[model samples]
Target: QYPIINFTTAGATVQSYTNFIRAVRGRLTTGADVRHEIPVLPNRVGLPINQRFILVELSNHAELSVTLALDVTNAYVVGYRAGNSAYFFHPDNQEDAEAITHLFTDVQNRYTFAFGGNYDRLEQLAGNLRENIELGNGPLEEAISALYYYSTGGTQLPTLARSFIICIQMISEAARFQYIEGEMRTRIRYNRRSAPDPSVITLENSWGRLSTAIQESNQGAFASPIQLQRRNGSKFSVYDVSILIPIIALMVYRCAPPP
Candidate 1:
């Protein structure tokens, strides 16, 4: 397996930063075996949640041993991928955040119907959604577009996760949203239940994992007794969100009218 670099910097803290710097420096001492503090942006009103950390550049003579003597990265069951960390930048850093955000470019492109997000690209998601959604599904689709803007453009990760989740819900509702099926179902034809779509089941498991763990409304498991929890479910990166979006396209496809 690839070395599990702690991408989700949840519970990563000042104590861990100082401790890790001192700990790693103790093991490796020489020229260019740099163990140094990394500069990070601080959290502000509209900026991403800030993350701070120390960086250690390993030298060859120091590569002889390894340990986690003071490491706290393993403190959580499911990493929330938010907050500050000693080892890496959290999504609060715009660059790292965008790396995840850009992964959805093609997904965004697939439905570029141009009703959401003024951020560099136009999204056509609402375009087809309006056409296919039920009696009032058009308004729902508009709301979905506005939500996409709020989440993706510059809001918070929770907004994105919530948007990701609601998008899944909307698309799942669209999964069986055929034009005449419901209208004619009153008379009934294919009454037997059928298998689930990947979009359907995938969203369920995905949402279950995210909300059940850290995203709880009341309170959920805290990452560490030390560092304060940042946003509850920053654990969900595009890494998680990216999985179902394409499948949602399929769900949308399933709802189309003859075209």
Candidate 2:
């Protein structure tokens, strides 16, 4: 139930992704204006993640950079390739630095990430999602805190199964609005064609593939990390794999429901 656009580079690591963030951090913040700006990281790093997606999201308009603050947030930990610290989410085992570096060049000129402050707009969406879970939810409680661990070098995954189950529940529930008659749907028809243009169909974008991997991490469990390794094509944990997709998928539930 996703798009066909794939933006992941095989054999890449979060380290390469991290360094990419660092460079963007360096490149953008170099200006004399200390007020500073950098692109916001998506709830799950959305949209085909294609160089083209950035092209569109920022092309006509775009961010207050409601950041995951990727550059700084991911820069806190340093793995010695020796596992000496708390085992967090630095799954940088493959070689994507070169590829990632090239990827940066493609979007380097882009000053923003989405149109009409879309990144900030989505932050409110993610913010409410965070709010709802904090209201009463418990099992997946530490997910964000674990993310805090990785960003600042905290701890290992709380419970792999807890995250896997939450993703399964959230993904299915999020799609409830997509269908009322099994086929009566709401996919966007941009430029009117036989099928919806993949880019406009937000349900499955680059985050779509990322979303699928998190869902596949089922009760069987072994595939959780494997699917992540494949999708990420590098060394990431089940923690690395699990944290973002629930927010990424269910991220669309922003409007207040009818009482």
Candidate 3:
């Protein structure tokens, strides 16, 4: 993941940066045809395409960082042209596209249900997902680590929402205790409770609501118009923001405290 830095000053436009990201990592650009590349031949079965989203953070032109989240499927039809195979080449396989379209549609329908039923579903889903996903290993685990998922229209958290997320990551990554003065660690728990509930902590963003909405890529429905979920699916990551506090502070000030 690109550490939080200013992309504007990186001299690369968002599109350029996104392109560079897509190149290094295996993220398929939106509308990019992978039918031929995927090669769904007559003998093969499925390719098991993996889908994820990238989160790019541009606090100013000088700083940018990337994060990720995974939206996985139960399974994908891979292995083309092998035996009793199903095939769709990388050029323009509408079959695969349609399958993905419905996958998103299904997710969106679920979201619609939870959005109106009770926020509890949203909380449970986020809690479970975050609990299951291990940082730095979720989306970019397979190939490159260039924080490319952000360009894929993954879930975008507001600054405040991201703060809670940052805290969540810190709680998991940082040292459990502060041995030295002002030097904190994960030892210092942020909240004393059995578990952090999603409904109460609206700060971190009830991720499920928005995530469900994004996952519904049914194109046209009485649902959200945003086609956030696409391609392989989605994947995620929780980065240790504590690793950056010192750098950010020192870069801007002389009296940087121990983080």
Candidate 4:
């Protein structure tokens, strides 16, 4: 699936920057709808439409990086399309925008291929993805190179030979968690705002179980934080932040005295 980046600059006036962001988002949407189709790649066989998608919504300007723990149906959902997307806000005065764009593009490209068809290939990608996260550094350039080598029929990277093997494990797991995340949000929101007192206990128990699962899968599933240059040539970092809604709901539930 193709990803979209909504570009922005910090040097402009409030209205001016907002307008520019809108213009960029519009252009992005138009381009995606008209000239581009989410690549019908092999790896994205089972993800939801929104999970395998990306966005540049206008309201999240200051958020350079964050992850949304969404709920779909009864499960929790997490991943790139489930709000793991990044914001590439940079300064208007320097080459920050260009630099950020180039970096973001390269990373996005890697993920596109990494998630593409073949269970074997996905297995290899899962390894690389975890390595990248555990390593906690920059891009796993060598690992990615090795992956490409085997996927394209090369013997040079024997370590990645498994890249050709197709397995449903990785994609299925990702989608599973995406469901859990979505469910967490839904349950919490329902409990906090709409559900009757009698309904609260059942949803609360489910959320508690789901939160533990989330903690276990939290590592190696998130994107590396992105560092961007701001308007005055200062460096700013953006990355995903996991929000646990159930705990927050508990607080509200206890404090507000069961509305």
Choose 2 or 4, whichever is better by lDDT: 4
Please tell me which predicted candidate would have the highest lDDT against the true structure. 4
What RMSD, rounded to one decimal, does every model reach? 22.8, 21.0, 20.9, 20.3
TM-score of 4: 0.21
RMSD of 4: 20.3
Instruction: Tell me, by TM-score, which candidate is best.
Output: 4
Model 1: which ten-residue window has the lowest total lDDT? 67-76
State the TM-score for model 2.
0.20
Query: Against the correct fold, how does model 1 do in TM-score?
Result: 0.18
Candidate 3 Cα errors over 4 Å, as ranges: 1-9, 28-60, 64-66, 72-259
Q: Write the per-residue lDDT of candidate 4 for residues 86-172, one digit (tens) a residue.
A: 322122324323323333333422222223333234346455432222210011122333333442455243244232221111112
lDDT, model 4, position 236: 47
* Model 4 residue 145 lDDT score: 35
Going through the candidates in order, what is the number of backbone clashes in each?
7, 4, 56, 26
Candidate 1: tens digits of C-alpha lDDT, residues 77-181: 111121121111123346434433322222323222112222111113232222232322222233334333442355343343333233223322222222212
Worst ten in a row by lDDT for model 4: 250-259
Better of 1 and 3 by lDDT: 1
- Kindly list the per-residue Cα lDDT of model 2 for residues 110-130, writing each as its tens digit: 222122212223334344222
